[PDB]
């Protein structure tokens, strides 16, 4: 079914590397996406698969402007405090490096 | 900045329909959005949506568990403390429009 999300925002921190529970490598970063209206940003976790993870970790850093096109994915997991965390993330088909 | 979400899916439950403390209609539901790829089995994503005003009224009046719907909106994050004292991070789709597809 149709699942498409597009964002332009600035990274809140330097991107990271991580391995999925199944051992697949990804890059992760958080995008601060300023709203168009007035009463503020939204903070959206993004996930890049395969070698695109290397472009993300080398070209972007905290404050970099980026654009993402991808799909929204839900998952959940138990954190270290033994707590069930529910997340909705953008799994990126492409990341555009705007600056 | 650019922030756009489009989804087609089916409601996992009857929408929840209420009037906020500002006086606006509010509707919430979870859209089960099937993935295009397959594992052979095909998995789904479960996206929390919220709609306000006339679109909320329409959602309550026409959508029910299992209904096919299309949403066009924006992705919003927020924070809250639960009664256990834990910070909970919320990501949901705030719908500008809902399309009824059945
Ligand atoms: O962050 C993630 N994105 C997609 C996945 F399939 C997963 O396991 N973890």
Residue numbers in the entry:
A (entry chain A): 1 to 39, 45 to 104
B (entry chain B): 1 to 39, 42 to 104
Cite, word for word, the article reporting this structure.
Single-stranded DNA-binding proteins (SSBs) play a crucial role in DNA metabolism by binding and stabilizing single-stranded DNA (ssDNA) intermediates. The majority of SSBs adopt homotetrameric configurations for activity. Diverging from E. coli, which harbors a solitary SSB variant (EcSSB), certain bacteria like Staphylococcus aureus exhibit a more complex scenario with the presence of three paralogous SSBs, specifically referred to as SaSsbA, SaSsbB, and SaSsbC. Of these, SaSsbA may be an EcSSB counterpart due to its possession of an acidic tip and sequence resemblance to EcSSBn.
For the investigation of the binding mode, we solved the complexed crystal structure of SaSsbA with 5-FU at a resolution of 2.3 Å. The individual monomer within this complexed SaSsbA revealed the characteristic OB-fold structure, featuring a β-barrel comprising 5 β-strands capped with an α-helix. Within this complex structure of a SaSsbA dimer, a single glycerol molecule and one 5-FU molecule were encapsulated. The positioning of this glycerol molecule, designated as Glycerol 3, within the SaSsbA–5-FU complex closely mirrored that of Glycerol 1 within the glycerol-bound SaSsbA. Residues R18, P21, V52, F54, Q78, R80, E94, and V96, positioned within a contact distance of <4 Å, were instrumental in the binding of 5-FU. The electrostatic potential surface of the SaSsbA complexed with 5-FU unveiled that 5-FU effectively occupied the groove within SaSsbA, a site significant for single-stranded DNA binding. The positive (blue) and negative (red) charge distributions underscored that several critical basic residues on the SaSsbA surface, which are exposed to the solvent and collectively form a binding pathway conducive for accommodating ssDNA binding ssDNA (gold). Notably, a substantial conformational change was observed in R18 upon 5-FU binding, resulting in a shift of its side chain position by 7.2 Å and an angular alteration of 77.4°. However, intriguingly, our complexed structure revealed distinct 5-FU binding configurations for SaSsbA and SaSsbB.
